[PDB]
Specification:
The structure is cut from a larger assembly and holds chains A (about 40 residues) and B (about 250 residues). Chain A is largely without helices or strands and about 40 residues long. Chain B has a single domain, classed as Jelly Rolls, CATH 2.60.120.20. Chain B has helices at about 80-90, 140-145; strands spanning about 5-10, 10-15, 25, 55, 60, 70-75, 90-95, 95-100, 110-120, 150, 170-175, 180-185, 205-215, 225-230, 235-240. In chain B, the strands form 4 sheets. In chain B, strands 3, 4, 5, 8, 12 and 14 form a 6-stranded mixed β-sheet that branches. The longest helix of chain B is centred in the middle third of the chain and has 9 residues, at about 80-90. The chains are: A little secondary structure (about 40), B mainly beta (about 250). The chains hardly touch. Chain B: It comes from Coxsackievirus A10.
Chain lengths: ~40, ~250
Amino acid sequence: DPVEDIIRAISSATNVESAANTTPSSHRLETGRVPALQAA
Amino acid sequence: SDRVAQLTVGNSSITTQEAANIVLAYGEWPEYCPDTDATAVDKPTRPDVSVNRFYTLDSKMWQENSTGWYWKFPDVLNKTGVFGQNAQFHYLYRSGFCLHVQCNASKFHQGALLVAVIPEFVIAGRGSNTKPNEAPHPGFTTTFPGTTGATFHDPYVLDSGVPLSQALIYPHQWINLRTNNCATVIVPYINAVPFDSAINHSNFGLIVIPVSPLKYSSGATTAIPITITIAPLNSEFGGLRQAVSQ
């Protein structure tokens, strides 16, 4: 009371019992959305 | 309602007035690869009517000394039509086939032809050499004959070292010149992998052999051909790249 200044991990776990699946994806024609560009 | 058939695939169609049923190899139809069996992630191409259709090879003429011929599939089709082009630009091929063989003659002729479908049909070197170095092997033009077909040196052992009499295990039919003038077999895609390379690997060969020889009394027609017409049911292609003929 008399002196106030006196008063986690982002990553989580998941079970993986088999290799990852693959969902169907069509093309994309549009701007603003760019999955390829990375910055390492 | 039996001996008369019509087959329509693509822009091509086949009629026969004399036929003995139709064989469906191993009791299955050709089909596209199910999502559960597939492995390669990229999307296959499915031309449908431009690939799937009847292609007709040249005719093999039929003599008294003839020992019989064979072909390899898809190999016979790798240079022809749009089917030959897709198989060159793609690394991964899958499909079935519908095979049709035309041989006719007249009620004074006689003979029989064994028509079979042999999965993984391996030709064999002919020689007494037991050393894998000095032992002979067949040439590429023999292993994969192409459109021109090949011929048997020893039709009795099927050139593979295996008796012809037991060839009736494979999906087959006979052309018996008193009974039917055509033989038709519908082959599913058979292989130990879902896709494969049409260029490096032939799924199965076709075989036409005279178990009983051609005979005709003088004055009748000496020239009998054997024509072959094959259609690629349910084709897929994957792994698109530049063109490789071999």
